[PDB]
């Protein structure tokens, strides 16, 4: 047997994968308090850690890489078919 092509749908990158990185980009959990209190994030037993790279990060990165690889494979197939068409057209012309 050989490994199968599995991963997140290439049409749904904006979503489960998109939101995961969007949260770390926003870093909204360490914004200033709305009342002006000196307290903020990182001042509780449960606090945000936006500089973290462990946990499900590895799984998300693997899924994103697999989706990118599948998209690259599709693009290469499209280029191959276009090249074949061009070569056949050139061969027809050169006769």
């Amino acid at each position: 047997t050989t490994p199968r092509q599995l991963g997140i749908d290439t049409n749904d990158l904006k979503g489960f994968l998109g939101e995961y990185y969007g949260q770390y980009k926003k870093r909204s959990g360490i914004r200033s308090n709305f009342l002006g209190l000196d307290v903020t994030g990182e001042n509780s037993i449960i606090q945000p850690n936006y500089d973290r790279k462990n946990g499900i990060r590895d799984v998300i990165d693997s899924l994103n890489a697999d989706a990118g690889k599948r998209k690259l494979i599709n693009l290469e197939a499209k280029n191959f078919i276009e090249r074949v068409e061009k070569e056949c057209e050139q061969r027809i012309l050169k006769k």
């Binding site: 092509q5 599995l6 991963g7 749908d9 939101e19 590895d58």
Partner: protein
């Protein structure tokens, strides 16, 4: 979004599936066999959820629940007839004394234990379709899944054959008390008419509901209601447009199950007057299968 879930659900599910399947296959008591089969199916459900197709998980749950319940009712009738002796080592030749139970158990078990051309084959097929391959312990996970899936045949065959069609092993009284000619009447039965009707209706409704769910989910037109989840696993790609690799890979498990069926059917463990004729029948079946395949594929 749980790293722990990703690592733990498939491994534990597959280990439980293998353990329960093998223990159920080797089990000798009806209730214990059903309990270990339930453990194996719970493991398969965990592995399906790890795959991440909630529709497949729901289908597996429905199939398992319905047919496990039906089989439990059948074995309950068998035990009540056998006077609370749940071990089939004292059960033999019950097909005639419990005619309805025999056929009901046949249908329920073939559906429950994933067997080809049965309503319960598709749940395991979809589980193997959706199984993920990025796991570090994927070798162990896959081997355990295969062993657990094949284990169903052994326990189903043992339960059905030993309970009903095996040589009479039970106490003489069990058969004699019911074989008296005075009991011969239109009302004669070792079970309840209400029990039979309930089992029949349960089986019919289970078939109908499973078909409805299969149409809702596995059909080309997806008509299931929203699952309120934004995680797409891409598993449906190998169910809609499978590739030659996976199509031939499934054949490995199919043929493993076929060989195990042949073993449980034609394998002789005790001397009998039909040993030579059984070997002859096996040879006839092999040669006829070969010729039939030849004609079907090439000669038409």
């Amino acid at each position: 979004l749980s790293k722990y879930a990703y690592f733990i659900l498939p491994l534990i599910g597959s280990v439980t599936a293998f353990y329960g399947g093998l223990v159920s296959a080797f089990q000798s008591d009806t209730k214990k066999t059903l309990a270990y089969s339930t453990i194996s199916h719970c493991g398969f459900l965990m592995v399906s959820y790890s795959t991440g197709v909630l529709e497949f998980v729901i289908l597996y749950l429905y199939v398992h629940g319905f047919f496990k319940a039906a089989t439990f009712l059948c074995v309950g009738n068998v035990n009540r007839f056998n006077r609370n002796i749940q071990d089939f080592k004292r059960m033999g030749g019950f097909y005639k004394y419990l005619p309805f139970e025999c056929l009901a158990s046949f249908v329920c078990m073939i559906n429950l234990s994933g067997l080809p051309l049965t309503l319960g084959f598709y749940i395991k097929h979809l589980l193997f379709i959706g199984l993920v391959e990025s796991y570090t312990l994927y070798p162990l996970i896959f081997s355990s899944l295969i062993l657990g899936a094949i284990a169903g045949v052994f326990y189903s065959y043992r339960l059905f054959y030993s309970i009903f069609f095996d040589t009479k092993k039970g106490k003489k009284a069990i058969y004699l008390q019911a074989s008296r000619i005075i009991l011969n009447s239109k009302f004669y039965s070792n079970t309840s008419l209400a029990s039979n009707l309930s089992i029949t209706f349960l089986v019919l409704i289970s078939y109908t509901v499973i078909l409805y769910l299969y149409c809702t989910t596995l059909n080309n037109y997806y008509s299931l209601s929203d699952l309120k989840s934004i995680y797409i696993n891409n598993a449906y790609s190998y169910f809609y447009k499978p590739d030659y690799n996976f199509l031939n890979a499934v054949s490995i498990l199919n043929w493993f199950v076929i060989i195990l069926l042949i073993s449980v059917i034609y394998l002789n463990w005790r001397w009998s007057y039909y040993y030579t004729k059984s070997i002859d029948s096996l040879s006839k079946f092999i040669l006829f299968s070969f010729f039939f395949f030849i004609f079907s594929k090439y000669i038409l």
